[PDB]
Design a binder for this molecule. Structure first.
Ligand SMILES: Cc1oc(-c2ccccc2)nc1CCCc1ccc(C[C@@H](C(=O)O)n2cccc2)cc1
Lengths: 254, 253
């Protein structure tokens, strides 16, 4: 029934709003033009120095930035974890499976949601208070110059679909309820749920983007691009391990 | 109009049948015991390999190469039948084939597989999964991920008419590295995706969201290709005397 799919769609949009403080609509207004404020721009080493001193950020510079992405990605995991629980049926799943789906899904959500904060020239930083340019990130080092580049390329491609928060809220849920995560114990109810969410997403895009033909298919094929980016992210973290050689190390276990 | 989509579905299926001599329907008939087709000789060890022939790890490897070269040429014929494909920039035609070819091969190879092995030699033979594992250190690994994919993919229970549209969709992907005109390619794929969407709903009415589940397999396919390339580079260096087929070299370049 199309009413229940629409009900599922709004539920999720309502949860998403409560879970994620900095929304795409907001990020876009900031990027985009709503000149009621302005983010501090970081475009080289000197602008970074002021960036710290001016707005509060709670060794080598290339390292210090990388460690900031870690801090922020840990914050995002809690936000995504909170959102997951609102997805109808998710908390009724076996607890090991809940943890499994969060464990593997979280990086895909992060880069998906990152794209909302990125344009072709840079990324909003620190609750949108800043803007780190793409050039500045390119110019970091032999290891750290390629950390963000693949994520900018995906964003450019992802953002060309012009999804909004109402669309994304349902896409994110689809991602979490992936029944192919390794080590899952009861795959059926996960797929039962994802199938329900895929119906709601399908209907969401049709009503919200009636002229955008086959957008559902294009977005689902963007799931390969997310998976490939996540794959080649740990491929950098393996090399970081052999370059960046205590109780904080524990907090950012992964 | 759906009628236009049904016409495209029919057209692609027809070309599929004309391009691929060993269909899934034929493959399944041979595997299950249908008396339309005849039973395969089974290769499960060295003597059974010696009998069927009436160093082996390399022999099997060069055998898979010859079959991929053969498949590439079949896939190339199929592609040309795809409305709009031959009208594309020639450079892109080659690029779409370069990256789409192996993804098609592993998709269609699933059709020839069950959990316990794979049809060979136009369905005359059947080589067991376990036998393929028992091969030399660098050659014992190549087929497993293909089997693990096939088991998952075959569970969707697509038929040749479904596969015909899906492989069309794979070929006309506008995200291939180095394409010149993404728009004409994506316009055609939209049309194909619509057709597939209608094909699946009609052909598999009781099968919820098969379209979405099918598209998500394109993830699994791309991983299979990367694992394989990695694994070929190991053999380049291990086996200095082993030759890869020119057509396969230029694809992997
Ligand atoms: C296990 C087996 O053995 C034979 C075979 C064929 C003829 C003679 C002896 C064995 N075919 C198969 C499997 C089906 C054919 C087949 C297998 C694998 C591939 C992928 C293919 C590729 O990546 O291009 N390849 C090349 C070398 C190793 C893999 C393409 C085609």
């Amino acid at each position: 029934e199309s009413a229940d799919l629409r009900a599922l769609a709004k539920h999720l949009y309502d949860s998403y709003i409560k879970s994620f403080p900095l929304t795409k609509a907001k990020a876009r207004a900031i990027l985009g033009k709503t000149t009621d404020k302005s983010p501090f721009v970081i475009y080289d080493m000197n602008s970074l120095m002021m960036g710290e001193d001016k707005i509060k950020f709670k060794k080598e510079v290339a390292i210090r930035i990388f460690q900031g992405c870690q801090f922020r990605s840990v914050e995002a995991v809690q936000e995504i974890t909170e959102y997951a629980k609102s997805i109808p049926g998710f908390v009724n799943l076996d607890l090991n499976d809940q943890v499994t789906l969060l464990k593997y899904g979280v990086h895909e959500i992060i880069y998906t949601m990152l794209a909302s904060l990125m344009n072709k020239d840079g990324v909003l930083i620190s609750e949108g208070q800043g803007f780190m340019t793409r050039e500045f990130l390119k110019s970091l080092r032999k290891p750290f110059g390629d950390f963000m580049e693949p994520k900018f390329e995906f964003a450019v491609k992802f953002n060309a679909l012009e999804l909004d928060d109402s669309d994304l809220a349902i896409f994110i849920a689809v991602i979490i309820l992936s029944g192919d995560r390794p080590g899952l114990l009861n795959v059926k109810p996960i797929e039962d749920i994802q199938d329900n969410l895929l119906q709601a997403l399908e209907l969401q895009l049709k009503l919200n983007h009636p002229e955008s033909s086959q957008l559902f298919a294009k977005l689902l094929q963007k799931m390969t691009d997310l998976r490939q980016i996540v794959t080649e992210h740990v491929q950098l973290l393996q090399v970081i391990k052999k370059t960046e050689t205590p109780l904080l190390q524990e907090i950012y276990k992964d």
